[PDB]
Design a protein around this nucleic acid. Structure first.
Ligand SMILES: [Mg+2]
Ligand SMILES: [Mg+2]
Ligand SMILES: [Mg+2]
Ligand SMILES: [Mg+2]
Ligand SMILES: [Mg+2]
Lengths: 82, 58, 137
RNA sequence: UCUGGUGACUAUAGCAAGGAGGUCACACCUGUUCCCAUGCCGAACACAGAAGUUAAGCUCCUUAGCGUCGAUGGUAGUCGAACUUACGUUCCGCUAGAGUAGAACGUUGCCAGGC
RNA sequence: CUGGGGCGGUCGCCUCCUAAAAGGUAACGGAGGCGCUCAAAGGUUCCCUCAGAAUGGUUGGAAAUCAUUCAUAGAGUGUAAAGGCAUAAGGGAGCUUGACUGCGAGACCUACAAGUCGAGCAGGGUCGAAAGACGGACUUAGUGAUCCGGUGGUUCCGCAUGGAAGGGCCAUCGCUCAACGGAUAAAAGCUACCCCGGGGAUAACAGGCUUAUCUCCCCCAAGAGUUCACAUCGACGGGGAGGUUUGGCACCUCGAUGUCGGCUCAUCGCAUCCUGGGGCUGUAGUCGGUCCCAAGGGUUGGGCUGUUCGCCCAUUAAAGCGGUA
RNA sequence: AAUAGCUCACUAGUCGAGUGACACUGCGCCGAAAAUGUACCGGGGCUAAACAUAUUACCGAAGCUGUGGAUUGUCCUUUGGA
RNA sequence: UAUUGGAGGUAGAGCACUGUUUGGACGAGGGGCCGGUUACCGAAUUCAGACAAACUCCGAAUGCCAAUUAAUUUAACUUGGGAGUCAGAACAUGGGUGAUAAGGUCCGUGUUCGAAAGGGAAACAGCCCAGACCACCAGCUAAGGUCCCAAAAUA
RNA sequence: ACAAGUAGUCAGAGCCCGUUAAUGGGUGAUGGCGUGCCUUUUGUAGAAUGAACCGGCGAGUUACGAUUUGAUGCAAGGUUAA
């Protein structure tokens, strides 16, 4: 088994299950996380809030819709009619 | 209007996907057959697994 | 045309050698040129060597442009070692060629002299080649 | 469509260059007594005014020089298949990016006075 | 843990790539950080915009400060990296303590224990004119179960009864337990005197795959050789064949496949050492060199080392190279 | 060792039809040496019994049909057939 | 599966950022010297070229999440009783490691073997075709084939 | 007594015999197919292990308690222990 040859990079962290958590078109209850992120890949929109961890959660019950903000950003919305 | 589908090739050695599709069409064993109505939903499944089945206008 | 003066990361995943030339498929600087028809990794010692051959024949008459630069480093493990224990150290610098890539350009010299020079370069080189002129029309 | 607010839209909306203009609206202006204005400036900010002045900010019109938008077709890649071990080949879908024509010197709701 | 052990390295957390455009994903794979820091680098209210560049100058090591038009942020964000950020999350300034108490519909993660995000409802605040915003630092590391012991509340229990000693509950403290899910409060070695139970799950021998190394062959032809690439030799480079070396892999064999030299006996390949046939030559013949065809036969005796090998002394026409566990 | 220089720069005429080069391809050739015995088609053997492009037959399985038979399940009651 | 809606940055491209790079313009700094001239050399600024797992102004195919919803199929979940499994293997394909070595090693995605008989591949767990309830001296075919060994074309 | 054999099966002539009479028994020229069994394994005809051959013996039971299922009483009650 070789001998003394050793490497200084065998370390990593535990991945965080970030990304999307709900899709366009499903009924989310209020509080449902829609998109765990870092920084702002998606800003909150209508009836959506920003956690301390940049998490996005619905304010109220309703359907979820991802949309465009300006030329190159995205927000999120929730609408209650159900 | 109405078409006829027969499983001409076996399903052994094919991904689960293709076997599930074949299950969805309601075909059981090799050379089994069914008659269904022409429908874009059904054509979607025939086209996906055309290499295992064959069609007829019956 | 030997080595990159500095690279950020020095132990890089080896290059893909399957597909077609992303670019450099035309004579832009020269009059006659030389493209490749297979793919291989071309090392710095081979380029230097094909160059000396080409330019000894032209007898310092006309100009030369090397179109391939050895960017990728490659590693080789030390001799008689087992598998494992890290990645080896850099042994040379390479630049992948794939069918279509022009490797050498020349100008300011007659056609037959250029063809002879590029021929002599072709043999110091590990890839099948082809003689080409400045595309026009 | 004027003119000034205030939403809406991926700059096709923008930058520049040129040309106008003031319909009393806008500015620039003219001052510090006051509320206020600081660190470091009446600049700014706040305020008190209107003698001035289209000069600029602004608005309207021109122009694709720049930025932006951008197909058709072809190509790369690739799902599936059938060959095959070739730095592969074929068939069938999907189908870029770059580039080319071109688009384009915005539309636009509401509110108030205009005409 | 380990491409057999040993030696070296590592062990828990965070970030990035490998990771194949959800998530996840391994190697003793490629790169770095953490075991903190901030009473302002927290909350809120109101303000402000940057690095660099030239048109440049009292200094001008150049650029310190100052000036002016462009500066898409090329700057800053306490720190690693990655996502973010002019709504500013960046920079000031003024108040301030929400770096609250009791909780939490719902959701994410996930074997478990844990971890993460929360609208909203009370209590009592802060800042703001208000709307509001505030349960710590732009986000993500900066940590450690239980048992036990200490400290402060509570006044729950407290062995006939009243106290009390002791417990319970809530708050908190004491771990490089870093081998970081922590065997104990407390722990290093040699066995060639070894033993037992096991394994070809795993090494030494050869068998097998590979051919980096190794032997041989080739291709191009700068060149040396008076002249002349190509009698001979051929640099820089490039392409192969073989399975004889040093290895890599761990596939058969550990309920045993004796391993090195020598002796006896060989047998087969030919990339031929001699002998036979030739092309050549920088071959006048003897001489030698080179290449081709050729495996029929032949291919010594000793000194020195356990040596294979190698050197040496005498010969020979020659004293061949390998396979065969 | 000065050099001895005929022939494909070049065509009448020996005489009279053709003859350099270039690409891009389809199939072969050489490079090509290993150890018990052919021994890199399974053997014989094959100039098609190889290859390419079409077309038409046929063989070929415990696949799938045909007939008979178990044993379970779901339906009709066809208390029997499916 | 058909139709909508969406998250994400791979293949490919591209150089707008971090860099890595080959030629050509163009003025200029320390400096050849007397602050110097000219060569240059360190860059500024351009035009044409290229390279990238840890570059991205861009950006598929496909996968994934979900729907007012269709069409075809027949599972799915909850609770309880009983387990075995924690040595995998080879092929194909995307990657790391090694040497674009291995019947190597470590991942992803199928299939098969494991736990699978039968036909083809001479023989040959993993390849191709195909899943054996039990007869039958019936028939049709898949992969492979049709001169003889050896069923079928000396088509 | 010209033959290449995990010793069978399947197809079958010839030759003898005649039953638990049934589409019968013994042998088998010759053809087709076909590398024991166990264990252990990713994978074994394995040259991995185990057994010379026959016979006998030779391994999840019992006590107490829990949990779950079936059964049976009787049920807001059910049941006894010494
Ligand atoms: Mg022992
Ligand atoms: Mg034994
Ligand atoms: Mg045995
Ligand atoms: Mg034996
Ligand atoms: Mg025995």
């Amino acid at each position: 088994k070789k001998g003394v040859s050793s490497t200084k990079n065998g370390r990593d962290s535990e991945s965080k299950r970030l990304g999307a958590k709900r899709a366009d078109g499903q009924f989310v209850t209020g509080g449902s996380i829609l998109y765990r992120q870092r920084g702002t890949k998606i800003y909150p929109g209508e009836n959506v809030g920003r956690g301390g961890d940049d998490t996005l959660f619905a304010k109220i019950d309703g359907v979820v819709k991802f949309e465009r903000k300006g030329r190159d950003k995205k927000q999120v919305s929730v609408y209650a009619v159900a | 209007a109405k078409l006829q589908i027969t499983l001409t090739r076996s399903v052994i050695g094919r991904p689960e996907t293709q076997r599930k599709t074949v299950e969805a069409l309601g075909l059981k064993k090799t050379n089994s057959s069914v008659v269904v109505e022409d429908n874009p939903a059904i054509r979607g499944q025939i086209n996906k697994v055309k290499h295992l089945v064959t069609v007829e206008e019956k | 045309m030997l080595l990159p003066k500095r690279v950020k990361y020095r132990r890089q995943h080896r290059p893909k050698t399957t597909g077609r030339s992303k670019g450099g498929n035309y004579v832009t600087f020269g009059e006659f040129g030389l493209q490749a028809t297979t793919t291989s990794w071309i090392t710095s010692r081979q380029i230097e060597s094909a160059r000396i051959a080409m330019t000894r024949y032209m007898k310092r008459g006309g100009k030369v442009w090397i179109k391939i630069f050895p960017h990728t480093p490659y590693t080789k493990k030390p001799l008689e070692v087992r598998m494992g224990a890290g990645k080896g150290a850099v042994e040379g610098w390479i630049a992948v060629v794939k069918p279509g890539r022009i490797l050498f350009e020349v100008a300011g010299v007659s056609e037959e002299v250029a063809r002879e020079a590029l021929r002599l370069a072709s043999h110091k080189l590990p890839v099948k080649t082809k003689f080409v002129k400045r595309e026009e029309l």
